[PDB]
Amino acid sequence: SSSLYRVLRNAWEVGPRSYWKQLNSIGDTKSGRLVGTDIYGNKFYETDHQDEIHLRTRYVEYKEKDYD
Amino acid sequence: MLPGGPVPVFKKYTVGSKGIWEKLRVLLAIAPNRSTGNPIVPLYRVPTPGSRPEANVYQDP
Amino acid sequence: PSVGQDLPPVGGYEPVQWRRNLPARGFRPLVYLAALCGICGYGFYRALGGIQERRELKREK
Amino acid sequence: INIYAGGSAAAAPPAGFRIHRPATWEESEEGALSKATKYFLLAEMFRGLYVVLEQFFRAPYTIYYPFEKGPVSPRFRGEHALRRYPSGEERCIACKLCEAICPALAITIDAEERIDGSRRTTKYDIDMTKCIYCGYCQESCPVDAIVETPNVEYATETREELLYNKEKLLANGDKWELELQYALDADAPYR
Amino acid sequence: MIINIVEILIFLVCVLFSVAYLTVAERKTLAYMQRRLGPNFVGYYGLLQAFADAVKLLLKEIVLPKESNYIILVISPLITLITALIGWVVIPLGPGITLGELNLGILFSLAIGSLGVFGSLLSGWSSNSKYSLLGSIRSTAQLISYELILTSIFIIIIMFVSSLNITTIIETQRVVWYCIPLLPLLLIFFIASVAETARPPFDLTESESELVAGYFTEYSGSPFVFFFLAEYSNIILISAFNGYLLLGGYLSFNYSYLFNILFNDYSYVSFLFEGLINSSAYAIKLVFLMFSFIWVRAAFPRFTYDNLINFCWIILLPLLFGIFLIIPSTLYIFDSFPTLI
Amino acid sequence: AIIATAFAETVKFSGSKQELQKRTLALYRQFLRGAPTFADLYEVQFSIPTIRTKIRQEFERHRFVDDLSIQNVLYAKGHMEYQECINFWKQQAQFLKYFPEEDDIQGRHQPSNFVDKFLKNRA
Amino acid sequence: RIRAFTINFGPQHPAAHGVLRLILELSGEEIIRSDPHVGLLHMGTEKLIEYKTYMQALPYFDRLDYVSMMTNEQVFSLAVEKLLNVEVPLRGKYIRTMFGEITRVLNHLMSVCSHAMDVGALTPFLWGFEEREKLMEFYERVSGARLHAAYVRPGGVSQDLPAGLLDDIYMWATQFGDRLDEIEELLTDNRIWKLRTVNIGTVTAQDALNLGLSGPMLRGSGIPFDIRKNAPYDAYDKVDFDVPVGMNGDCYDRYLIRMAEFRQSLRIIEQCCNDMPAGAVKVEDFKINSPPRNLMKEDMEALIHHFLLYTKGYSVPPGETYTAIEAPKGEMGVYVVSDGSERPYKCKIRAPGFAHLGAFDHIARGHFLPDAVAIIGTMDLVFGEVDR
Amino acid sequence: APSWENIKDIRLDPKVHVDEVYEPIVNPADRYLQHVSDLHQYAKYIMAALPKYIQGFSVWKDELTLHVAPSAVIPVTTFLRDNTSTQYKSIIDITAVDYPSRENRFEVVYNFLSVRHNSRIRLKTYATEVTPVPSITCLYEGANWFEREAYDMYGVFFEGHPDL
Amino acid sequence: MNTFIIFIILIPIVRLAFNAAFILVAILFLPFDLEISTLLPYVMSIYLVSNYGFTIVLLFLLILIIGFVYEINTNALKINKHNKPNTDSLIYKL
């Protein structure tokens, strides 16, 4: 949606630690349920909100700072 | 009308506005018929191509 | 035969808009000119009223 | 009915082909002051700018690639891989059909009789700098050994890391087997 | 003279930082108009992109072609930045809250916008090759042809107020902004402003030369950076001319009844809140017009040099030499010639 | 109409050796007059006389060709190359293809008798 | 005496959709002579095809144009079927049609919206390329690849459509007219677009025919030629559509034709989605088309045929043919020759951008450089095609 | 009341069911027989009309070919461009082909089109590495580039060409 | 030392052919610039020259509009193309 209410509600949903982590990694704020974690430690989420267009429902949160 | 439009918004499969924002859009739009163009997530590309049930029943035509 | 083939629906699909949908909008132009000259004339009134008062304040000074 | 001389009823012109005429300034059903206002206040220009602005308030299409990937299909053709049976044995038998149909002649094979009396490979190479990613090689194989993964993230700093050999392909297939099983379970019936 | 140093450094910091983030604002505004985003990865939402483009260009080689001049390609961007910056001195952010506070401020800006052309003139002489010297000529003819049209508007409004002090011109706009009686001049001034900066839809030479092997600004290193802090500042400056000439400058809602209700005395708080309100009106106006430079860029296609010189000397100038006759007549009809104060 | 470029000659197959003699001589003359241009346009590291020497060598190559049609073909190809060179179409590499000799001696052993070729398996 | 000034437009040109060394000769601003140089991207396709089977060579014809792949391979499929004397099944015809029009959309988008960007309007480009990127998902679903694909093969189609594709096509189709209209708003009625496109690149009927020009360049002069009507090939005879035509032969008329072709192609896509017959998508003769795998792994003759088609290939009868299509650029064509072998003896791709660039000298004489840009943009040459 | 949130989910809509697909077996060449008889008559007219030049003609599936010699190119092209029944005004292609087994190894091929009558036609000559061919740039300006191609690709020399 | 005086020092120290419209545009920019600059004294003395110097500057501007009229109707600034499109008619002697 690119609206401010989205980021504000998301930052209320997921706490400030995850906010600064998302800001330092993705560049966006995103909140959604966990689906699981792989063998390298990378966590994978999914969203249901209407605001999120196609191809932005599922996202990753890498473990290493040097993500690839 | 003709066999080629125009067609309203509630038949186009795009993500639109809801509530007072729709009234405002239909006010401030050159053509309120027009769509944002973002597809509707529940429908577009669902079920995913790697999970289509129809592949188990498929047989060479 | 055919079993699992991607096939159309029985009632077909609802028609799409393929014709031009650029609806002419706006008032007729002379209204936009009449608002233009009216805004201008109101601004000339308000300004030339502000010049005559500056003239008198200068007479005082 | 009609007899034609160096012509036909198709090449006869359309009934209304002759365009009527250009209109002049007279026979203009739009007064001079109206089109003057549209000339001096730049109407269609403001309209185009407003159609631009409405996009300013709409959802952008962009996705963040390393954290959100774009759509991928089972039919997709990326990196190569050599598969195995559930038994742990490899599927390649050196039929050398992949070596023959390949347009770019990237593949290079050399077989011989294995110690157990079977047909197997000692060399299987792919020059991914020759590959065009056509998928004819996953189509010819009658055992579904060679495949093309959806992986596309295999760039390198050197051109000699792209001359894949058998060991680099067998490990790539050991790695991506779960993804290959998904794509195969939803692509094989059509293939 | 300490606070004079403080006041200079404040101004320079505010203007240069505004220029740096006008680059980012140009890119993000233009992006969202194009249904994309970004720069939003080089900072906390892209607020460090401009300093990254800078620092990359300052650690970049200073490479000079064989058959080129060195001194001309070096000083000419530098002199362009200087001339573009000194026009900021006469620009007010409050009634007398100006560094210059000259009584000839209009004429100072008008003489400095005449000195600006020399950057484009000396660029073509940085290339001894023959086609660049004609491409610079195209780009000079647009500027000197459009400066006649910007000036003519300065004179048309000064018929209303007979003073070259910028603050006085703004204080006469308490009664009404001069964009209401002379609304068409708002379009004309904004068109000509976009032209003088060689901005789209008037970017003929940079495009016509981007195809060719030369005839553009093929600089590198620091001179790139100065030319891109001199384009994005001449933009604000020409937007400011629009502001203090037609849009009331720093003026806003009368804050008489509010300040009466809330303060009771002239303290060093009321002066601050006043200067905040004034500058904020001046700033939001500059923002809307910088948005408009971008808005125009996103939409309209390009002009050709024939269409452009024809636009100027055959359509705009006649309307203005007409307006030169209608306005003095309009004052003479009603006995409303302004006084010298 | 699609008009011809600068130094274009229309292809015309002469029926006699006596006319092609003249046309070839004009081509040789043009190459020689234009050699300094071939030295300026292409950043050349040798003499104008050496260019004229190579031109004389290239014309001595086919000096003993008596079949008329082959001579007409050779003349047309040479005019093509003159048009390619004088208009700045060729770059330096495609021009110095004709001057291998000027480049530095490629190594030491350049076999010319049998035994060296045998030791290098070139016989 | 007018002495000229030779300039290179540049082999390193941001504007051109490819690499072109254009040598112009100017007397001030006016162009008087033009010598388009090419071969900077000529890969040598027509020779290599002679060493490859008729199947191995299909990928060549997709790399001859950066866009417009599925039509470019639809020409080779038709030539080789005409030689083999086989008939495509109906479902394969309708698919080849639908993807031909999806491809014409994908080409006209790039073409019109590169003309814009070379003329300065950066925005319609990026408003259209998203539509291209939704339409390429359909490509990756049917073929696996995003651009160069190889779906259409001699004897029909490689693999059938996956389930749930016509639905998504219908969705995109219901929403596409709006975005085309948003492009028309900026470009069509605008003044500057007309100033840059009205009485430019003007070419007459007789000249357009003498120069070999086809497609919109010809339909802008007033001649109604469309191979899809005058010589229907796949299913363009079993589906309704109209052919726009224009007077004045300028760039503006060609732009209007291209937008009209967008909308008529949308009409065709809707129709084909509403009637996709069942059946096979490829010829049922396993001597030409590889069989299914559930037979190749259970029946002997099918495995033999698989082996031979994927080693030696199929033997085309001796003969020769030029067959052509209405490719979005123009009238594309292939001149194949056969000698009774699985390898072609000759294959000349007739490339409409070739004749377009060849006419460029006749078309640009008298015009200034911005108009030369607009002219190359009317033709929107794809220089990989121009260089063959 | 209606909105995109209440839009019909077409994915569930009932889909056509076909039990047996019926595709008749047919030769694709029975479609062409009458056009082929017509092309034979037309070629016969042209051979009777220009006996000095036309050596032969072939026909194969709605494609005609006329065999000539290099001298006969300009005349026959004039006939095929200017005659009323054969207004072949457009030049589609030029192509050479190498048949080394022949004395004259090359075989230049012109393709032509008539938007008027909606027809194509071919025209073949022969050449060698040294025997040139007349250029039809006198008539069709588009032949300029195609003849430059055929020269560069195969070596054939097109006499009269302004800039080969 | 004034802040203007501090600032106005600190900033600096920390073969071919052409069409004659290319040259006329510059050559004509001079007189029109001198006109618009000579109009400055009027706008700054407009009150003191009440209704006399008004009429004087109008005759000034009208005289200058004459020269502008001469420029337009000559079409000086227009670019002229040499490779004209043929508009003769095709006539065959019989």
Ligand code: SF4
């Ligand atoms: S898919 Fe790749 S590896 Fe396989 S044959 Fe084609 S180019 Fe070669």
Ligand code: SF4
């Ligand atoms: S086709 Fe399959 S089995 Fe045969 S050689 Fe290739 S990979 Fe091995």
